[PDB]
Amino acid sequence: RTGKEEMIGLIGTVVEELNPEGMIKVRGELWKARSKFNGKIEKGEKVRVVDMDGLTLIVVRERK
Amino acid sequence: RTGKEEMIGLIGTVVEELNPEGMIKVRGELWKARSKFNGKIEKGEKVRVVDMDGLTLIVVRERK
Ligand code: NA
Ligand code: NA
């Protein structure tokens, strides 16, 4: 398993809208992702990785 | 309660070494903080807020 320690804190870009679940690109890799609070994070938006649920990244939109 | 949504994703600076518990400054406020994985994050280091445990911020050191 690619651990939590490797992913948490990284920035990615939404490639498939998080509504609240979707798809993000982090480094070169595609990942399943879920926004922590927001109902919807749009394609192209920058997100921050804050946790991990199995192979699903939990993200908030990047601040400012 | 100042919710998780307000704090998660923000950057702060360690004001009292996280070993793993300590003190950080986020915005103008002093907060209790705990590093998520690391055994020790030093004074002056930049951290990212990834979660919250009561009034204690859970942080990783800022990437790159
Ligand atoms: Na949600
Ligand atoms: Na620990």
**Of the candidates A63, A42, A39, A53, which has an alpha carbon nearest to the alpha carbon of residue B6?**
A63
Give the span between the Cα atoms of B2 and B19, in whole angstroms.
25
- Vertex A44 angle, CA A38 and A45, to 5°: 35
Interface touch A8/B62, C-beta < 8 Å: no
Q: Which CATH number fits domain A1-64: 3.30.70.270, 2.40.50.140, 3.40.50.1110, 3.20.20.450?
A: 2.40.50.140
User: Which ligand is closest in space to the CA of residue A40?
Assistant: 1
Helices (H), A1-64: 4-7
User: Amino acid identity of B25?
Assistant: K
The resolution in Å comes to: 2.4
Residue ranges of domains in chain A: 1-64
The β-bridge relationship of strands B21-26 and B11-16 is: antiparallel
Gyration radius of chain B over CA positions: 10
**CB-CB neighbours of B61 under 10 Å:** 17
Residue A61 is encoded by which pair of tokens? 């939109």
Query: From the list A37, A48, A51, which residue is nearest B5 (CB)?
Result: A37
On whether the CB atoms of residues A60 and A35 are closer than 8 A, the answer is yes
Using CA coordinates, name the residue in chain B closest to A7. B63
Cα B10 from chain centroid (whole Å) = 9
The residue among B48, B52, B57 with the most chain A CBs within 10 A of its CB, best to mutate, is B48
